[PDB]
């Protein structure tokens, strides 16, 4: 019975308006999704026009973007760290649009060694043990090595992104509404976004 009318409330002059007709069916409201984390549960509700909107209650993975060289991979949600709207909504593990979370760094790393052939992560004191990448390094011709060399002539990124890559988690943002389409898409935070939201987290946690 949650309404979305514009006649329960006062006017511009401050005088009360008297309602003349009751609550209609196009005027409808529904309770909040409160999209948590966990094993994935998605419910469907019938809306006006007979269409369906996917209510994402819990979810595991997301399809994020990393725009420095335009790659997108399916990535697991790890933990939510910041929400610009409510400070309670970080204490309860909730997902909203334009929210600030941490995602795992493995598939972007695998794409980085598989495309640019430079090591990402792999902190000093422990080198590449399971012997897969130098197998791909070998048995090449001269033209293909020239093509990789001209590609990795410029292979620089931000140092904060590198520090997140040794840390194993990338700070990410959600650009999709999970209570309407049922998925959690978005893009990873880069550039001035990283320093701004890191300043916000270090100010709040202090």
């Amino acid at each position: 019975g949650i309404s979305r009318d514009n006649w329960h409330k006062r006017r511009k002059t401050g005088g009360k308006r008297k309602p003349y007709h009751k609550k209609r069916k196009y005027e409808l409201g529904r309770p909040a999704a409160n999209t948590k984390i966990g094993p994935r549960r998605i419910h469907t509700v019938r809306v006006r026009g007979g269409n369906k909107k996917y209510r994402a209650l819990r979810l595991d993975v997301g399809n994020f973007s990393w725009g420095s060289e335009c790659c997108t991979r399916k990535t697991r949600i790890i933990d939510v760290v910041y929400n610009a709207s409510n400070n309670e909504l970080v204490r309860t593990k909730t997902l909203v649009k334009n929210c600030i979370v941490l995602i795992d760094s493995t598939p972007y790393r695998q794409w980085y060694e598989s495309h640019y052939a430079l090591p990402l992560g792999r902190k000093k004191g422990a080198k590449l043990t399971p012997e897969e990448e130098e197998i791909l390094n070998k048995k090449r011709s001269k033209k293909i090595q020239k093509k990789y060399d001209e590609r990795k002539k410029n292979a620089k990124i931000s140092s904060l992104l590198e520090e997140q890559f040794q840390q194993g988690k990338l700070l990410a943002c959600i650009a999709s509404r999970p209570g309407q389409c049922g998925r959690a898409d978005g893009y990873v935070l880069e550039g001035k976004e990283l320093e701004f939201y890191l300043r916000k987290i270090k100010a709040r946690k202090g």
């Binding site: 725009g67 420095s68 610009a84 334009n98 880069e190 550039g191 701004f196 939201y197």
Partner: protein
Amino acid sequence: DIQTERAYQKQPTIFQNKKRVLLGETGKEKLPRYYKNIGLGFKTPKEAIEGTYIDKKCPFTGNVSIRGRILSGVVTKMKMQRTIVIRRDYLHYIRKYNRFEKRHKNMSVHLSPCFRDVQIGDIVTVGECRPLSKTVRFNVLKVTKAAGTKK
């Protein structure tokens, strides 16, 4: 001067993190500015071109369109932020007594920070938009100064 609140302010048309060859100087750190011609014979000003303010309801750098009616009014009060109230003085006619009466219907319009050379009494024109607030429906297209104020 910018980035005041708890979220980042950006224009969702451009990409602000393009990867250059060097990421040093001499070609970087001048971000592009999104703007469009609103039409109806109106000309976009330079402050919307070279400015650094961020809006989502500005008619020039924003996601709002101009269609419908074009009105005019006189600026009365500048107290609430990023939006102003104008006064429209008009004459009403009575058939019985063949004599006019003046009436006023003040209403709130939106002022972007592009027009910051606005004082009380300046004549402005507005254009109809989608509802941007509870009582705000119009966006200011241009500003015209009143008499005096030669400084």
